[PDB]
């Protein structure tokens with residue numbers, strides 16, 4: 163592997179565009195601060211039946227050490243168009259491209275959430291957001307970063323919540339995460355947190371779909387109501403105390419597709435987690451829209 | 453930067469149900485490569501999770517180089533390579549003198565005490581119990597010291613895998629072990645250590661005499677002894693390995709026999725600690 167170009171740097175570590183046997187690959191180099199995400203992602207990618215067109219493709223994971231220095235690498239497919247967050251900054255969507263994106267995300271999420279016997283455990287992501295979705299050259303997306311994932315099997319009644327003090331991205335946390343009332347030993351609780359975050363992603367995408375010559379600028383969820391670099395408490399205030407949800411631009415109600423998407427995202431945002439749609443129902447609804 | 457991950461596999465040095473171990477070459481140096489069967493993936497996951505928690509570095513612990521998952525899934529553990537092989541291998545083709553026998557057993561005690569001890573701080577470690585100590589899980593280094601290998605069953609203060617039945621302590625065989633008490637697992641390691649000390653002491657020459665290499669309980673259980681075979685010997689009959697008369701003519705072997713007795717008490721809380729074993733060994737000879 164030759165590391166060519168740094169494509170991301172934060173507290174998790176860095177991601178590099180790398181060359182391997184002539185092909186681009188993505189190399190995530192973890193900080194020791196996030197070593198538990200490296201191990202969790204490795205446990206999740208050990209599932210051969212995780213493999214799916216809308217899940218970021220695994221190549222290898224390695225821990226290498228000499229003396230007191232440890233290197234933690236995750237190597238995946240490389241998507242040169244980058245994340246959905248990057249794509250939406252500068253590009254607008256037509257109806258077909260908007261539905262293709264959101265159906266591909268629903269398809270990946272339903273794949274994660276549903277157990278296959280024989281297989282793959284049921285999986286909840288816990289950090290779904292537009293920076294954790296990659297855009298592929300076919301116009302479908304794939305879901306990335308399983309470092310916070312929770313696994314469940316109904317066949318053995320086993321829940322595996324892993325060992326990771328990391329929490330989800332604050333801007334996308336559901337009300338029950340922000341108020342810390344979430345039932346921690348309930349697998350359905352985790353799926354419902356993913357559905358809340360999916361609704362926010364739907365909103366980010368729909369804003370960029372043109373209708374009647376109008377589009378909204380890219381904004382992240384709750385851009386207008388919290389400080390820059392919002393705290394956990396900043397998010398709790400708007401989501402839990404103020405009962406805020408992302409505003410639906412009135413121009414959407416002129417367009418059948420955006421009217422349907424607004425209905426879908428509202429059914430992701432109930433404060434009652436058990437009222438929210440399932441990923442399978444979202445996928446079926448998006449298979450029927452326009 | 454170009455990261456070279458070119459490992460060449462040269463010769464297979466071990467093959468079991470676990471998988472295989474190869475002598476390999478990495479940047480001109482010998483490394484050992486363990487290739488796991490999918491049947492024993494939990495052992496790779498446990499050892500990897502442990503090393504991702506605490507990067508153990510100790511002269512008497514097999515040196516960690518890398519843990520690799522490649523996409524079925526292939527799971528590889530890469531360590532230092534010890535050309536003299538396992539203590540089990542080594543004791544079949546050599547006898548020992550007083551100095552080499554003590555250096556072997558004190559190095560094992562040193563590795564085990566390092567596993568067992570909690571050290572506070574950024575630079576520290578959780579306490580660890582091995583749970584499968586035996587002569588095949590100890591390697592002989594060129595300098596005459598040993599190192600402990602295989603943390604697949606280790607616990608920090610796997611899965612279908614259980615300890616090697618020949619070396620199981622009485623409380624494991626009678627299922628009385630207090631499973632939520634970390635000290636219980638240390639005491640299981642001390643039992644197994646005592647058996648290893650017996651295996652090594654047999655091969656130490658005194659007055660021109662040596663015993664043949666044998667595994668513990670060779671005279672009272674079959675090959676691949678069952679759980680019931682072991683329970684009847686160790687729990688019901690309370691048998692222990694034989695101390696030959698000739699040891700009692702040798703001050704070193706007399707001291708070693710006393711030490712192994714203090715590793716084999718039926719009551720696990722009566723057994724010596726690894727630290728107390730080290731101290732005793734430093735005062736022999």
Ligand SMILES: COc1cc(-c2cncc(-c3ccc(C4CCN(C)CC4)cc3)c2C)cc(OC)c1OC
Nearest residue numbers: 226227228229231232233478479481483516517518
């Ligand atoms: C695991 O295995 C082996 C690896 C290597 C090896 C090869 N390339 C680069 C490195 C390296 C360089 C520099 C740092 C540090 C420098 C100080 N600070 C800034 C943090 C980072 C870390 C690591 C290494 C250690 C050599 C070995 O020996 C020949 C190994 O053993 C077989």
Ligand SMILES: COc1cc(-c2cncc(-c3ccc(C4CCN(C)CC4)cc3)c2C)cc(OC)c1OC
Nearest residue numbers: 169177188189190238240241244245248294306307
């Ligand atoms: C989310 O998580 C993971 C993602 C990836 C990954 C895979 N393909 C492509 C990328 C990418 C490439 C390029 C850009 C551009 C965007 C715009 N521009 C201003 C600079 C950079 C962004 C992103 C990434 C980040 C790999 C990972 O692991 C190896 C991930 O972690 C699991």
Ligand SMILES: COc1cc(-c2cncc(-c3ccc(C4CCN(C)CC4)cc3)c2C)cc(OC)c1OC
Nearest residue numbers: 465473484485486529531533534537538589601602
């Ligand atoms: C117990 O466990 C592990 C052990 C090892 C390991 C490390 N050095 C050397 C060896 C070895 C080499 C050579 C022989 C024999 C064969 C050839 N003939 C010339 C006689 C000598 C035996 C043994 C091993 C098996 C590595 C492991 O992992 C990578 C182990 O698992 C954690």
